[PDB]
UniProtKB/Swiss-Prot annotation, chains A, B, C:
GO terms for biological process: cell wall organization. The gene is glfA. Changing residue 315 to A: Lowers the catalytic efficiency. InterPro entries: FAD/NAD-bd_sf. It holds the Pfam family NAD_binding_8. Changing residue 91 to A: Lowers the catalytic efficiency by a factor of 14. Coiled coil: none annotated. This is UDP-galactopyranose mutase. FAD binds at residues 16, 36, 44, 59, 61, 240, 325, 445, 454-456, 459. It comes from Aspergillus fumigatus.
Length: 505, 505, 505
């Protein structure tokens, strides 16, 4: 008989595991506990800080919630109005010296006329083709072409998506983009060209909120703190090293064993297979594909430059920079970087030269967070990637050669994106049911490996729904039907349901 | 304070209400009770018996379950093997003296050559227009013409559907029919014409099980029996006369008042509106449409005729008989009619004449169940409908003129089919949300008025899911997404969920 | 025995009759003769002159030859290089107070931005519908909507075409327009909108030559002069009043009778029917439709204004003027108006007011020629149309209010355009064969009533080909296959054929 026994064991306290935990805690029926190898909950939704005081999420993290239940927990965790800042969803695409508003096609009036011709001609071809299309596109690349046409494809989505996914667009499926037909809005695009008009898809309605303190990682610390502490086990004392599926026991690094009746695993499914010592599942999970993420942070002296302004995130299809995305992280919260009165020396200038002085000087400061993808089809030289990113910032005119850099940050996250390869579903529909047969709910960004339901809210709800399936027999909608949950009003499930209202009488 | 107070009150003990009751009973949290004006539960899924011992369902009732939860409750209620009979579906459409395998549109091969031409020609035209169509059909009639062509429309779909729906095809929408109306495939249908092959396998009820005793009504009597008796109130004592939505109070016929927190109402929603004395709702519910159903039963002396054989239910598009469907109800169970030793006099011959004597002779007996529709667009002579049905049986060669009729049955059910009119959804989205904001869950065949989820399993699950939404914040999937629940295997929710398993440990 | 007998009689000495005459004269086999009621040959290709010395054609006459035979005869008649002036076509459409290069539909790029959107949107709809179309358009309006879209239809094609044809586009067929109405290309037109480029080169009259003296009418005077005088009878002495098709006898106004073996009649076919006293033919001809043309000429004092420049003819779709077209007739030849030293009093100022002086003053002079259509569907006030035209010139800024008018011209031509009505062909295939049976070749603009082969070269060749059929069994290609002769270079028939070469030895 094991050291600890519980009805439901949750491995991992990133968003998915915390969702499972929040729902278990709310139901307050079956016994449970949650473990994690990190002392700080949050997983890939955590936040780091540099010795100079610049915070960085694991790349650009922007919340777009599809669920009331997620809103209920975030509101419970950070309830005061100044626990959050609200921003319009402002983004641009860097293209031929221009910051083109997102989405790219509605803004090609900024491009040279010769290119507008090429773009509109291709989109005309695509519209005429879409009018008689009776088949669905099979690859990401076929979907891009059919929706954008050849010309607009080549400028943005094709070279951009290679830089994100670190695999070619011809190697990915396209079901993950949803059930909407790959077709051009030719009239809308052509109208903006005729009118010489730009127009981004943001505004008063198209907002996001960002935590005032602690970056994105602050949310999940705050949510985890609503859990009964004695049911949590975070740190080296919570690292799972062995899973015995046939015996329903888990072993921690410090030798502690935990018995379960149902297991919600939120670790990477390939790590799970290894921890189970199941050669068959190991072989199957190795057939999946993922890219690694390098996050580069650069802290800059100065008030925010006019050329930067209220930009939030930025896309980089071109090859004059290694990053696919930049975030003006200082625009998300004033507490993402030191106050103006904090004194820091200049480490270097953006062109790489030494500062004129070594003295500490005051701010204010602003901050850029960059993402570089890595895979076997796209290597990354870890020794030079920081300097390459900074050169990238000059090339894209985000930084002047003279701009003063006061903080740098680089970290590699091995499992960054679960790739929607052509083979992904063929592999997962083998892996997930074999685990399901052993009472293991493998869920999450890498627990279930589905990017289209791979955001914080999706993840959290994957945990919530898993628990609901285990206890109340609910359908796991987010797991199995991404287009469905992403397209509907998910308002039925709440942090206080009927069951708790009736029980309290 | 009212006489009785429950958290959830369930009005009606047909399948929908019994569903709510079963789930409320399983969950065993909030207090509840269920009321019906009938002493015998079952609603339109009940069974009558004639004084001569012939049972008749409310028209042809064949179970095709889309849900494990529904299976669990039927199996609990009738757990023995000899509680059920299994049957292969044998279904035909009567057309020009011939029997055409169901579905008609997939069996053009059995028609005379000249009618095959008209049908295939129409289907070729439809196929070619459909290759370039980029707008969905609006009405049932447009859908028919666009999916099958004019030949099949005129020969079968238009007269048949007026004859069952009691409105023309032009008056109905076409989003309800995914699992009711087969779309013919040009190549497949033409291939079977050339090869002279049938294709009678389409649809969810190609196999079915029928209760050995009590008809369909036996199921719901048995299901109801599994509930705690003290939480039920069936009979005159349970007839709801007033619903006061603002006070959350219901008044029964005997003056008993029941206070509730949440109301699941499964009575026809137009009745509910009247009971609420809500003139705005009465006005809205009157924009809905329904047809009435006459059920005619005919008991016949003799061993089962060869021309009848293993036939299950039969469709009649033609105007030489008033009924749209006949069921060989004696094929569903030996106990739907008397044993062969039972002595019964002949009441009349099928040709309408008196028999020679009043002598009670033995059997065996077989039995036909007929349905005639009625509406404000399709009047029915109540006084002659029985004799008209019997003559229809002679015209269609179901009965020989000399056949000996030993029992007759006729009953009119005012609310038979909830009609999928063009206006339905526009009216329902004014009605159901209004009731919802008063904490009223109106659900079921006439409770929420949606035929595409209007079968026994559907109904049962509307009640189940309503409770699950009330207690556990579940999505009401069957109510809002018929194609979704009709096209998947719904296996997640069970009579015993983890909740009950864990609570017993 | 009649007064005169010839093998072939030609009625009319417009271009069609002269064509018949020239071919008969070249062949020099059958005896022949040509009559006209007018002392001066030319018909609708004649030229009038005002007492002040301003010449006016019957509206805008620009030669675009499809035939080497036609060129041969023009070169014979006017052999000197200084008999002709060559011009580049400068043609615009008046829209929203600006000039848009002809053709409108290829020059969307010169419209105001909001109309560019309207136009391109319509063309996009048309392109998408044309992608799946399997039916040919039946009316002119349907053709416009299908080839150009609603934007161009409403802004230009519908109002402009009513303004010329004097019937709505819905009343006309669309088989006539191959070389009359440019079909815009979506990609090309959109490209030129993006690039702000013009495309003014469409169609056969992008370059033209105009006779140096006598206007267009001078060509036909000179061509007629090459005919042997004794075989011509022009004037009151050559007016046909009765045609006796059965006795093959024509009666002239002075009572002179002419016997023929074959008749080539170039007069309006309705007039021919009347001259034949053939009530069945009259009824048939009355099913045809034509519009009348008002020609208004305005002579203006002054050197050619900068705003006019090298403009040739100009289209006016809008309602601030009654004419559909203006020609800068003084640009076609310096001899279309008086020399600069000619003294002429001012008749009026363009704004209607009397001149400051009544004295004769010098030039130079320029000259405007206007056209206004009339029909039973578009009445015209004969008494005010001159003044209305002049005011229209002020409205469109063709004339300053202070411009001095020294000459005015107004003439109504009752048969101006043979309308391509829906009924035209149905009617003509009754008429022309019934005349063919009587050995009458009815040919020409109103002789055979087909606008698509209704220009001077077409007409001329209808006469030539008529004769060639009578004598040599040639196919009448221009008559029966307009798209055939308009789409090729017709080089085979020359003013000197092998026949004449071989015979001269
Ligand atoms: C570059 C980039 C950019 C974005 C995003 C991610 C990345 C990488 N996201 C996605 C977001 O980060 C993601 O949805 C969640 O972090 C997924 O959480 P999971 O809990 O499934 O696992 P995740 O990897 O977060 O957490 C898993 C947890 O399991 C633990 N674990 C692993 N092995 C263990 C073991 N053996 N024993 C014990 N514990 C173990 C880990 O410590 C970790 O805490 C996002 N989201 C969004 O809402 N908006 C956005 O804009 C973005 N953008
Ligand atoms: C002709 C025909 C044919 C078929 C079918 C129906 C009909 C009419 N059905 C559908 C099936 O009958 C249906 O799904 C259920 O009976 C509907 O369940 P409810 O609980 O919604 O309504 P239903 O009408 O069954 O039950 C409502 C109940 O509420 C009660 N009630 C009404 N007013 C009240 C009041 N004032 N107070 C208290 N109680 C009140 C009534 O007494 C009744 O018992 C079927 N299904 C299938 O699975 N296979 C099939 O082939 C068919 N075919
Ligand atoms: C407003 C407008 C604009 C244009 C044009 C016309 C008009 C009205 N044309 C067309 C051109 O004018 C036309 O092609 C010829 O004039 C037609 O020659 P027909 O000989 O068939 O008849 P046409 O009518 O020219 O000649 C008929 C002859 O028959 C004679 N006649 C009638 N009744 C008679 C009787 N009872 N007895 C004896 N003789 C009789 C008449 O006197 C007349 O001479 C043109 N062409 C072109 O090449 N380029 C252009 O841009 C244009 N544009
Ligand atoms: O051969 C057939 C018989 C029926 N139907 C259609 O199927 C529908 C459902 O009838 P069914 O008898 O399966 O169900 P019920 O009327 O008993 O609810 C009808 O409305 C018909 O339009 C069909 O398309 N082909
Ligand atoms: O065959 C029918 C006859 C009537 N109704 C409904 O009944 C309403 C009329 O209600 P009223 O109480 O005025 O009763 P009725 O007019 O039928 O006598 C109509 O609006 C319809 O919605 C129906 O659905 N089917
Ligand atoms: O910009 C323009 C001007 C004219 N037309 C069409 O061209 C036809 C022929 O007109 P045009 O001035 O060539 O010849 P005409 O009327 O003098 O015979 C007209 O009926 C118009 O419908 C056109 O499509 N675009
Ligand atoms: O603008 C017009 C007016 C009349 N017509 C023709 O002239 C005939 C009418 O004849 P008319 O003016 O003699 O009157 P009606 O013969 O009917 O009395 C019509 O059938 C038309 O063919 C025409 O082509 N254009």
């Amino acid at each position: 008989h094991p050291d600890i026994s519980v009805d439901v064991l949750v491995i991992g306290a990133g968003p998915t595991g915390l969702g499972a935990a929040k729902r278990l805690n709310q139901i307050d029926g079956p016994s449970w506990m949650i473990v994690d190898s990190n002392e700080t909950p949050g997983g890939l939704a955590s936040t780091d800080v540099t010795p100079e005081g610049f915070l960085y999420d694991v790349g650009g993290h922007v919340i777009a919630s599809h669920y009331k239940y997620f809103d209920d927990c975030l509101d419970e965790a950070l309830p005061k109005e100044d626990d959050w800042y609200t921003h319009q969803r402002i983004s641009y695409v860097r293209c031929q010296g221009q910051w083109v508003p997102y989405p790219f096609q509605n803004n090609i009036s900024m491009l040279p006329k010769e290119e507008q011709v090429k773009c509109i001609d291709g989109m005309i071809d695509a519209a005429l083709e879409a009018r008689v299309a009776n088949t669905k596109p099979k690859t990401f690349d076929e979907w891009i072409v059919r929706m954008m046409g050849t010309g607009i494809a080549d400028l943005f989505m094709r070279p951009y998506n290679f830089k994100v996914w670190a695999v070619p667009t011809t190697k990915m499926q396209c079901a993950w983009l949803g059930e909407r037909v790959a077709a051009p809005n030719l009239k809308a695009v052509t109208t903006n060209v005729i009118l010489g008009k730009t127009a981004g898809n943001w505004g008063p309605n198209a907002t996001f909120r960002f935590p005032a303190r602690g970056g994105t990682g602050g949310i999940w610390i705050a949510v985890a703190n609503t859990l009964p502490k004695e049911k949590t086990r975070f740190g080296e004392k919570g690292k799972v090293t062995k899973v015995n599926a046939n015996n329903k026991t888990v072993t921690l690094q410090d030798g502690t064993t935990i018995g379960y009746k149902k297991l919600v695993s939120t670790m990477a499914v390939d790590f799970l297979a290894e921890a189970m010592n199941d050669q068959e599942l190991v072989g199957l999970t190795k057939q999946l594909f993922y890219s690694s993420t390098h996050v580069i942070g650069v802290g800059v002296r100065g008030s925010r430059p006019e050329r930067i302004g209220d930009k939030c995130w930025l896309y980089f299809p071109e090859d004059n920079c290694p990053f696919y995305r930049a975030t003006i992280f200082s625009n998300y919260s004033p507490y993402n970087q030191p106050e103006a009165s904090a004194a820091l020396p200049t480490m270097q200038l953006a062109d790489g030269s030494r500062p004129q002085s070594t003295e500490a000087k005051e701010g204010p400061y602003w901050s850029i967070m960059l993402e570089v993808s890595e895979s076997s089809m796209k290597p990354v030289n870890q020794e030079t990637i920081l300097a390459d990113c900074i050169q990238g910032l000059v090339n894209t005119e985000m930084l002047k050669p003279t701009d003063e850099i006061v903080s740098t940050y680089h970290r590699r996250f091995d499992h960054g994106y679960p790739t929607p390869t052509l083979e992904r579903e063929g592999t997962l529909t083998q892996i997930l049911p074999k685990l399901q047969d052993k009472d293991i709910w493998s869920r999450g960004r890498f627990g279930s490996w589905r990017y289209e339901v791979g955001n914080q809210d999706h993840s959290f709800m994957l945990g919530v729904e898993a628990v609901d399936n285990i206890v109340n027999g609910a359908v796991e909608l987010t797991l199995n039907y991404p287009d469905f949950v992403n397209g509907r009003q998910n308002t039925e499930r709440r942090l206080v349901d009927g069951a708790q209202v009736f029980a309290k009488s």
